[PDB]
């Protein structure tokens, strides 16, 4: 697949760009260009090009605007001391976009095309990648939407793959601050035979009310419990959860298993490997509120944190639910939590050795 480039003749001035990079926030600003690739049953993926960031054209009856056939991904690009630009496990996001597409009846995008789209975008907007060393980075948002017109209900025959980039400083409004959680009693994130294992837009729209409720109960984020027994802890918003038992080199990590409805986070998969590298024992199993509250109060569960691309790792210090409320440890970020976060971020920034070859050069 050959990419054609249509330079932006009116990009953001150096002043504006530098200003944005100084206080980027998250998903607020976007780079000067974006990648676009069209799909049709006859020509397959074609017309791959790098064009200026700008409004998209859609037919009023476009399937995505009626039957929500759409999927997305999220990863980052970092600038290293040697001036190189790299991404964290981009191949993993390429594979998950394919798995998400399959579940939503969307044509898969070749991984080499996915990776290439990333190189093409950085090639023109490399100056949007924050300076080396720091919590800042360039968030990459690959996504596919159904663009074929027609109000009939069925898989679209036309799709459009888009790749946009957004400078990122910090996702949450706390960063080095722990969050309180409300365990949803009324809502579920997904159920067996659903789309829980896919990065599907529909999953998020349906969770808006649950999040609003968490805040109304005086908590920062909502936490999901299995839809079958309404007992086992799954995730916190759009992030996976980890439970720390004990402390020091003898501490062990427990995280909900991939029941099939849980979203296989890449940060989650990476942290499991990092924990093992540090010598910590790991375990992927089911864990319910009862055990959580009991062991947390007993002092066995010393820390709890959520993980995801945007925030990397977010400490969980307070828990509230339909039948109780309790604090984790002293309510502050745990030792292991910060230890693993520093290790992961260090690897991503090129500070620590990348023994697993997770860092890929984009340039």
Ligand X SMILES: *Cc1c(COP(=O)(O)O)cnc(C)c1O
Question: Using the rule CB under 8 A, is 276 a contact of a copy of itself?
Answer: no
- Count how many Cα atoms sit within 13 Å of the Cα of residue 302 in the half-sphere of its side chain: 14
- Compute how many other C-beta atoms are within 10 angstroms of the C-beta atom of residue 147: 22
Question: Using the rule CB under 8 A, is 195 a contact of a copy of itself?
Answer: yes
Count of chain residues binding ligand X (CB under 6 A): 13
Report residue 45 as tokens: 């993926």
> At which residue do the structure tokens 């089911």 appear?
286
**Considering beta carbons, is residue 148 or 303 the nearer one to a copy of itself?**
148
Question: Using the rule CB under 6 A, is 199 a contact of ligand X?
Answer: yes
Pairing mode of beta strands 44-52, 4-5: parallel
Q: Which does 87 bind (CB under 5 to 8 A by kind): ligand X, a copy of itself, none?
A: none
Question: Using the rule CB under 8 A, is 346 a contact of a copy of itself?
Answer: no
Judged by CB under 8 A, the residue of 16, 176, 208, 281 near a copy of itself is 208
Judged by CB under 8 A, the residue of 110, 133, 175, 192 near a copy of itself is 192
Q: Which does 54 bind (CB under 5 to 8 A by kind): ligand X, a copy of itself, none?
A: a copy of itself
Q: Which residues are annotated as a binding site?
A: 96, 204, 266-267, 309
Give the shortest CB-62-to-ligand X separation in angstroms.
18
> At which residue do the structure tokens 């990348």 appear?
354
Question: Using the rule CB under 6 A, is 345 a contact of ligand X?
Answer: no
Instruction: Specify the DSSP element, H or E, that contains 60.
Output: none
**Considering beta carbons, is residue 241 or 254 the nearer one to ligand X?**
241
Question: Using the rule CB under 6 A, is 167 a contact of ligand X?
Answer: no
Q: Which does 308 bind (CB under 5 to 8 A by kind): a copy of itself, ligand X, none?
A: ligand X
**Considering beta carbons, is residue 265 or 315 the nearer one to ligand X?**
265
Alpha-carbon torsion 147, 200, 320, 230, what sign? positive
Pick the stretch among 46-54, 150-158, 266-274, 321-329 that binds ligand X (CB under 6 A): 266-274
**Considering beta carbons, is residue 167 or 308 the nearer one to ligand X?**
308
- Compute how many other C-beta atoms are within 10 angstroms of the C-beta atom of residue 170: 16
**Considering beta carbons, is residue 152 or 331 the nearer one to a copy of itself?**
152
Question: Using the rule CB under 8 A, is 164 a contact of a copy of itself?
Answer: yes
Please name every residue paired with 307 in a beta bridge, in sequence order, or none if there are none: 240, 313
- Provide φ and ψ at 143, rounded to 5°: -160, 155
> At which residue do the structure tokens 């054209």 appear?
57
- Provide φ and ψ at 51, rounded to 5°: -125, 170
Question: Cα–Cα distance between 84 and 355 in angstroms, integer?
Answer: 18
Question: Cα–Cα distance between 352 and 338 in angstroms, integer?
Answer: 15
Closest by alpha carbon to 313, among 273, 267, 278, 357? 267
Question: Using the rule CB under 6 A, is 267 a contact of ligand X?
Answer: yes
Pick the stretch among 119-127, 182-190, 290-298, 352-360 that binds a copy of itself (CB under 8 A): 182-190
Question: Cα–Cα distance between 230 and 188 in angstroms, integer?
Answer: 8
Give the shortest CB-9-to-a copy of itself separation in angstroms.
17
Size of the chain, expressed as the number of residues it contains: 363
Buried b vs exposed e over 248-264: b needs ≥16 C-beta within 10 Å? eeebebbbbeebebbbb
Judged by CB under 8 A, the residue of 22, 41, 56, 81 near a copy of itself is 56
Q: Which does 309 bind (CB under 5 to 8 A by kind): ligand X, a copy of itself, none?
A: ligand X
Pairing mode of beta strands 252-255, 281-284: parallel
Question: Using the rule CB under 6 A, is 315 a contact of ligand X?
Answer: no
> Which positions lie near a copy of itself, rule CB under 8 A?
26-28, 30, 34, 53-62, 64-70, 72, 103-105, 139, 141, 143, 145-146, 150-155, 162, 164, 166, 184, 186-188, 190-195, 200-206, 208-209, 211-212, 227-228, 237-238
């Amino acid at each position: 697949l050959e990419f054609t480039v249509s330079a932006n003749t009116n990009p953001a001035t150096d002043a504006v760009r530098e200003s944005i990079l100084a206080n980027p926030g998250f998903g607020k600003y976007y780079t000067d260009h974006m990648v676009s690739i069209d799909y049709t049953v006859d020509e397959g993926w074609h017309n791959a090009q790098v064009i200026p960031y700008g409004p998209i054209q859609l037919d009023p009856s476009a399937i995505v605007l009626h039957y929500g056939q759409e999927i997305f991904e999220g990863l980052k690009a970092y600038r290293w001391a040697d001036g190189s630009i790299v991404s964290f496990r981009p191949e993993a996001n390429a594979a998950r976009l394919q798995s998400s597409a399959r579940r939503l009846a969307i044509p898969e995008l070749p991984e080499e095309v996915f990776i290439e789209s990333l190189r093409q975008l950085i090639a023109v907007d490399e100056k949007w990648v924050p300076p080396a060393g720091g919590e800042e980075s360039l968030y990459l948002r690959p996504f596919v939407i159904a663009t074929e017109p027609g109000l009939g209900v069925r898989p679209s025959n036309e799709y459009r793959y888009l790749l946009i980039a957004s400078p990122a400083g910090a996702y949450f409004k706390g960063g080095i601050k722990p969050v309180s959680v409300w365990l949803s009693h009324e809502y579920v994130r997904a159920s067996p035979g659903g789309t829980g294992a896919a990065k599907f837009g529909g999953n998020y729209a349906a969770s808006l009310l649950a999040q609003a409720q968490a805040a109304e109960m005086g908590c920062d984020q909502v936490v999901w419990l299995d839809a079958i027994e309404r007992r086992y802890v799954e995730e916190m918003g759009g992030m996976n959860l980890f439970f720390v038992f004990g402390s020091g080199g003898s501490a062990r990590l427990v995280t909900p298993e991939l029941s099939g409805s849980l979203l296989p986070g890449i940060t989650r998969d990476s942290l499991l490997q990092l924990a093992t590298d540090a010598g910590f024992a790991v375990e992927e199993r089911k864990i319910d509120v009862d055990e959580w509250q009991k062991k947390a109060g007993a002092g066995e569960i010393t820390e709890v944190f959520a993980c995801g691309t945007a925030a990397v790792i977010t400490p969980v210090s307070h828990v509230k639910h339909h039948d109780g409320e309790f604090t984790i440890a002293d309510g502050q970020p745990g030792e292991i939590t910060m230890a693993l976060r520093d290790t992961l971020t260090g690897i991503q920034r090129g500070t620590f050795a990348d023994t697993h070859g997770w860092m890929a050069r984009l340039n």
